[PDB]
Design a protein around this ligand. Structure first.
Ligand SMILES: Nc1ncnc2c1ncn2[C@H]1C[C@H](O)[C@@H](COP(=O)(O)OP(=O)(O)O)O1
Ligand SMILES: Nc1ncnc2c1ncn2[C@H]1C[C@H](O)[C@@H](COP(=O)(O)OP(=O)(O)O)O1
Ligand SMILES: Nc1ncnc2c1ncn2[C@H]1C[C@H](O)[C@@H](COP(=O)(O)OP(=O)(O)O)O1
Ligand SMILES: [Cl-]
Ligand SMILES: [Cl-]
Lengths: 113, 113, 113
């Protein structure tokens, strides 16, 4: 029934992804700053004449509770606006939610978003 | 069996919510700073004579692994102490956990909390 | 099929845990800074002649999408390298993922990691 869509994306794509989501009626979301490691190349930094590799790079995590019937549309909006063609574009996880409660009213399920 | 309770709430309510949870025996939790977007009004900021809307506002995320039988009590404690009547009070997600392991001992399930 | 491994661990153990994971072929992960409360003792701080207890302590959250068949190996790698014997070593949650999408290509499931 309700699903959590969790996307890890490049920080510079947050504005285009969130504008495309709100334009399609998906305004609600929680956003957090994280770091990610993958196949993308780490960054090279210098310290006292030595170079070192930084393997964890800044990323953005977007979390959205949506009804299952909207999952594929949210996925397609995030993919179209987050992809760049280069390694490090990110992932999207779909995780089951067994209950959504709106703190303010106590509404649940679709009435809670 | 084990569930993850994930609550998004106003930052100024973190102390009252966490005191009410520990008073009821729910001490364990992970807390993180996030930003949220919803029906609540964004904030107005000024920069070089122009006003701009900030749509992502500071929120607090609380995560708690609890046994299913305690979920409704944890939900009610968070709702009573996090609600204010105004838009932006937040959400509570209940997500299945298929395994909980305590790093220190290797205990699992209820012995892992 | 696909599972999310989410580990809460001491910040000073992040390097040893992530080196042991990459050495075993598990490079991909998302890392975030959080605070945690549990049975471990809070910290004592002083402010204007008074002492106060800080109950929420810095922790590190590691998230990894893995195929179910690798979950127990990832758990054992995290436990061996994150445990210290003292209270506050952390937890590991295994959460179902119903869909993993690689933003860059649109690949899913095992081809998405
Ligand atoms: N197994 C995994 N679990 C969770 N997050 C992962 C993951 N593998 C990669 N990530 C996140 C962190 C990375 O910074 C981000 C992009 O990963 P990548 O492997 O560098 O590029 P790409 O996804 O384009 O193949 O996705
Ligand atoms: N679909 C969704 N998925 C995840 N988090 C959401 C969500 N909609 C809202 N949120 C989070 C971020 C918001 O800052 C917070 C409160 O949202 P709101 O819509 O502004 O007020 P309210 O929950 O009182 O209706 O909840
Ligand atoms: N019920 C729960 N839900 C989510 N995270 C928890 C939890 N209980 C504890 N934690 C996280 C935050 C803590 O800082 C960390 C370690 O907890 P602890 O109780 O202090 O030590 P230990 O896990 O060694 O028993 O795990
Ligand atoms: Cl965070
Ligand atoms: Cl989750």
């Amino acid at each position: 029934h309700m699903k959590k869509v969790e996307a890890i994306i490049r920080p510079e794509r947050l504005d285009i992804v969130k504008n495309a989501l709100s334009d399609a009626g998906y305004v609600g979301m929680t956003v957090s700053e994280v770091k990610g490691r993958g196949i993308q190349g780490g960054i090279v930094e210098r310290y006292r004449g030595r170079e070192y590799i930084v393997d964890l790079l800044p990323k953005i995590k977007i979390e959205m509770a949506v009804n299952d019937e909207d999952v594929e549309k949210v996925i397609d909006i995030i993919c179209e606006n987050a992809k760049t063609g280069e390694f490090g574009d990110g992932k999207i996880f779909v995780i089951p939610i067994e209950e959504v409660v709106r703190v303010r009213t106590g509404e649940r399920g679709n009435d809670a978003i």
